[PDB]
Structures are given as structure tokens and as C-alpha cells.
Amino acid sequence: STIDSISNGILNNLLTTLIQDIVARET
Amino acid sequence: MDTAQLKSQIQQYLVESGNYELISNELKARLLQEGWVDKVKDLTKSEMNINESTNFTQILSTVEPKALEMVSDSTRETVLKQIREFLEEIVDTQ
């Protein structure tokens, strides 16, 4: 789609990958 | 000393040169300096104490939306600009 929608798709991918890693440790 | 503007343009040339990891690693660094990672760590514990089933998915259901909102607006804007700027080199001028 849009350049900004892809931009946001990347940042969201990068952030939720990190978040997942943090939640998975559970501590 | 007003190094912000400089840092941006520099990154941009480096990413073009093939240094593609610089975006993700730079995001990571801004989050640590500001302390975002440590906050998500604690917010996770809070959620686990509330419901107290150790389940990952449902706990990710609430931690994730909040996690995306807590990133400092400067970190989001500066990093999102780096991605956007880079993307313009891959796709047509528009």
C-alpha cells in the first residue's frame, strides 16, 4: 500500500518482535 | 552539540551503502537509553500477577497494545523517518 503504511508495518514488526521476546521470558 | 540533524543524514547514507541492520539496532539502542525495555519487563509481571495463568498469548494480548504506546514519541518519529527515508530509495518517487 502506502509508503507510510509500509513504514509503520516495519516499525510494528520490529517492536512486536522485541515485545514478544520480553513477554516470553515472563520475567 | 546539536548533533541530531547530523546523525540523521549520516545514518541515511550508511543504510544506503548496505548497512541495513542499522535501522533495527538503532531502534534497539534508543529503547534502552530511554528505558522502554525495562518497562515492558515490569508491565509483563504486572499482567501475570493479575490473571496468574502463565499463558503467553492472552498476556501478550494486553502487554502488546500497551507496549506499542509506551515508546517515546521521539524514538518513534526518528526511527520511522529512517525507515520511510530508506523505503523511498526502494520504491518510486511519489
Side-chain angles (χ1 to χ4, degrees), chain A residues 2-27:
Chain A
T2 291
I3 286 188
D4 280 64
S5 74
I6 299 167
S7 297
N8 271 288
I10 299 310
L11 182 49
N12 185 256
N13 181 288
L14 291 171
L15 290 182
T16 61
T17 286
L18 271 167
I19 297 162
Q20 278 184 350
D21 292 344
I22 303 176
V23 179
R25 302 147 182 166
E26 302 159 358
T27 200

Side-chain angles (χ1 to χ4, degrees), chain B residues 37-54:
Chain B
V37 174
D38 204 48
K39 291 180 187 184
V40 181
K41 210 163 315 190
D42 295 351
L43 176 59
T44 297
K45 283 173 162 288
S46 307
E47 289 309 321
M48 278 162 55
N49 284 335
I50 289 171
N51 311 78
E52 254 183 313
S53 100
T54 321

Side-chain angles (χ1 to χ4, degrees), chain B residues 37-86:
Chain B
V37 174
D38 204 48
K39 291 180 187 184
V40 181
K41 210 163 315 190
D42 295 351
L43 176 59
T44 297
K45 283 173 162 288
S46 307
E47 289 309 321
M48 278 162 55
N49 284 335
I50 289 171
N51 311 78
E52 254 183 313
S53 100
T54 321
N55 175 282
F56 164 87
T57 286
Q58 303 298 23
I59 291 318
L60 186 74
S61 190
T62 73
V63 174
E64 193 183 294
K66 302 183 184 51
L68 296 167
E69 317 328 327
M70 337 200 335
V71 186
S72 67
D73 297 34
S74 97
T75 286
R76 173 173 296 269
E77 294 153 351
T78 59
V79 167
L80 188 68
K81 182 205 201 75
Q82 293 304 334
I83 296 173
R84 187 183 321 111
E85 292 281 5
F86 182 48

